[PDB]
């Protein structure tokens, strides 16, 4: 069980103007920290944010949240469960913000809700550090869907934020899980992203930024293009056949010819865009979603299971012989690899 704290700056809010919040479970025998990044699509207009508040209310609002939470995958506190960092300092922040972590907009005379994901971030690091954070080696900012995007989004920042109040010793790193999207043609969108960004005040990444450049900043939404610039170590979880990456392309799984082409064209794109990407696990499975998961640790590549791999990527950032970081599956089928979730 993590337990609730509300923001003590009571300025930093969800999108209802209720204050943000974390749920935490300490560990005083480690100086490792997981902050987690929940999920959950968004919003980007009045009308569509007016639709999730009747019905994806707690992903706007902190009124009906709960006093605990259980901590599961790689936030359990058990080594059966989590052999990776089952002794760390548990952290998991909730989504009520709508913008895909990146907005820093308040709710005033002039608009409706409130975006503050990038602020939400950096106020829970803050608070943090009056708890413990103080002591850190390791910040490792990880998150699923939605929250794989926000760690791309936020991990330099985090790190710059630490280096500035005085903390340079704290080695912050992210794991981002299924937040690698294509902007592919679809099989039967980008704007949205594009409304997003001007409705919530979005921010991106400074490097990415300025390469793309002024009305192009939705470029940094995509993995493969925002992750050449970022400087603080990134391991990348990324199933090759990814449900919400399906559905945003228009298919729905008797395949002929022209689905058959375009799916396997899917998992190939997806794997040359990861090729230059060191720290990486990507199997060949229909799925979304991993690193909370309870049975995150069932599925392998080559055989290596991704705890593994996290904790060979935690060896190499002191080639390893028996411990590779680089996992991505050359099959070219969804459930081409027998270990896939069923
Ligand atoms: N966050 C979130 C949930 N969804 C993830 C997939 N998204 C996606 C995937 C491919 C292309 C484009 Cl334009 C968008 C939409 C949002
Ligand atoms: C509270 O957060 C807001 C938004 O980031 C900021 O303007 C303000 O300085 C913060 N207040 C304190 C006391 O840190």
Redesign the pocket.
């Known amino acids: 069980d993590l337990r609730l704290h509300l923001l003590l700056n009571t300025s930093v809010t969800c999108n209802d103007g209720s204050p943000a919040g974390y749920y935490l479970k300490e560990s005083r025998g480690s100086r490792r920290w997981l902050l987690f990044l929940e ?4 919003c980007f207009n009045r009308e569509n944010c007016d639709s999730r508040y009747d019905t994806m209310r707690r992903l706007m609002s902190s009124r009906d949240w709960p006093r605990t939470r259980t901590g599961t995958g790689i936030l359990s506190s058990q080594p059966e469960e989590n052999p990776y960092w089952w002794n760390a300092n548990m952290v998991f922040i909730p989504y009520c913000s709508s913008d ?1 972590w990146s907005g820093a907009s308040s709710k005033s005379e002039k608009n409706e809700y409130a975006f503050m994901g990038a602020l939400i971030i950096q106020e829970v690091v803050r608070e943090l550090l009056g708890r413990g954070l103080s002591g850190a080696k390791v910040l490792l900012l990880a998150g699923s ?2 929250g794989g ?1 926000g760690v791309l989004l936020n991990v330099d920042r985090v790190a710059e934020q630490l280096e500035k109040l005085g903390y340079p010793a704290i080695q912050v790193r992210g794991l981002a899980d299924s ?1 690698w ?4 043609k679809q099989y039967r ?2 704007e ?2 594009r409304r997003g960004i001007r409705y919530w005040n979005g921010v991106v990444p400074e490097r990415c930024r300025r390469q793309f450049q002024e009305g192009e900043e939705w470029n940094c939404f ?1 993995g493969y293009k925002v992750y050449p610039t970022l400087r603080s170590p990134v391991f990348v979880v990324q199933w090759l056949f ?1 449900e ?2 399906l ?3 228009n298919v729905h799984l008797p395949v002929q010819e022209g689905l058959r082409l375009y799916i396997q064209n899917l998992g190939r794109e997806l794997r040359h865009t990861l090729k230059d990407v060191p720290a990486s696990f990507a199997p060949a499975c229909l799925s979304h979603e991993i690193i909370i998961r309870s049975h995150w640790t069932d599925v392998q590549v080559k055989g290596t299971s991704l705890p593994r791999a996290l904790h060979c990527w935690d060896r190499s950032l002191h080639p390893l012989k028996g411990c590779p970081v680089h996992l991505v599956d050359s099959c070219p089928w969804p459930h081409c690899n027998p270990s896939c979730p069923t």
């Open positions: 999920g959950g699509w968004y895909v869907s939605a995007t937040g999207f294509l902007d592919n969108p980008t949205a992203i995509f990814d919400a990456q559905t945003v392309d």
